Design a protein around this ligand. Structure first.
Ligand SMILES: CCCCCCCCCCCCCCCC(=O)O
Ligand SMILES: C=C(C)CCOP(=O)(O)OP(=O)(O)O
Lengths: 214, 197
């Protein structure tokens, strides 16, 4: 590739529809979401992508049935643990002042180098856009302070956002970082991840006309 | 005009593609914007006809003002004309953007409080200006409600810093044709996409 995004955001959606289409229960797709994340990680390391942010689950996601919440929470926990067994600088962002936040992930709420490091991997866990923006409007000297102090301030601008499951929407992922993100939608559900999904998203990105500005 | 089961309460419009449209016709980059005015009129007419409650037009942003002077005059004049032409019609008009600047057209200052379908224009708007303006109720764009469907002409799939608060859950529909090549079926196809969610 001629041009590569510095930072890729991943919305690994489609897990419940994927399960249903296979004659499984809605809650049973999320565990088939783990290996795909691993492949996105391996391809990203291989091409030398600097940063990937995975949309794990939101505060909004937690109003779902308990059976689904346990399943997507456990799949998020396992994904982080599995990337932690690899070569990554891991960070987890989300509301830690809540029962819903998995204790297992508290040790990743400050960027943690694992193995040989290099690539930055972020997870949004018990994340919410409103929580993110208001975090700053606690006790900030000024407006110029607020944006530097959003809960996600450590996560830089997203160049390319890739969403599985055929919906073209952000679902409140990082409103500040996504203002100029090029958005690529994969029609396949996340558990049907294929490398060509990512290769096609990267071609889309490199095909953008850079004369056109923001 | 087809009939629809579901309709968005609020549609955002990013009328992009004006410069590429001009270039493909052998015109100068700045010379497409004026061909953007009638399309806005047609989106307004179709929206009134189906009884869409609110439409927000992306006019121009603080970022857009770092483009050449020849382009800035041309998009600023086309925005001014578009507001004036919707004002000649049956509409509750609001203009949001940074009025504390030379760049903000004096002609539009009278529309920076709602008059009397609701039609909003972003004029010298900036996402950073918007948020740094309790907080969430007091963003510069607080009057503009959540966007249900955002339609962008000119083939790019991105928000270009349009209303980060209101667009968090917006379904986004991209028309490949440039804005001056607007066709009614662009909007109809966007509305079918919306109802099929
Ligand atoms: C106000 C609606 C019709 C106006 C007619 C055309 C002039 C408006 C300017 C077009 C550019 C707006 C979108 C640019 C998006 C971007 O910055 O990438
Ligand atoms: C990652 C999340 C939150 C799911 C994305 O879909 P939405 O969040 O837009 O889904 P609904 O609001 O329609 O449930």
């Amino acid at each position: 590739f001629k041009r590569l995004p510095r930072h890729i955001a991943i919305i690994p959606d489609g897990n419940r529809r994927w399960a249903l289409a296979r004659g499984l229960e809605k809650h049973e797709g999320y565990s088939s979401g783990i290996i795909p994340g691993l492949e996105v990680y391996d391809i990203c390391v291989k091409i030398g992508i600097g940063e990937v942010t995975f949309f794990g689950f939101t505060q909004d996601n937690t109003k779902r049935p308990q059976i689904q919440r346990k399943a997507f929470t456990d799949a998020c926990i396992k994904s982080v643990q599995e990337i932690a067994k690899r070569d990554a600088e891991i960070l987890v962002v989300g509301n830690t002042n809540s029962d819903i936040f998995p204790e297992e992930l508290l040790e990743y709420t400050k960027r943690t180098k694992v193995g040989k490091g290099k690539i930055k991997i972020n997870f949004l866990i018990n994340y919410g856009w409103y929580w993110d923006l208001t975090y700053a409007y606690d006790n900030s000297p000024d407006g110029k302070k607020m944006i530097e102090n959003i809960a996600s301030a450590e996560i830089p601008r997203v160049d390319l956002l890739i969403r599985w499951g055929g919906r073209c929407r952000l679902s409140g992922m990082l409103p500040v970082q996504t203002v100029y993100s090029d958005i690529y939608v994969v029609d396949e559900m996340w558990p049907d991840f294929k490398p060509e999904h990512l290769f096609k998203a990267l071609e889309f990105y490199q095909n953008q006309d850079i004369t056109l500005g923001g």
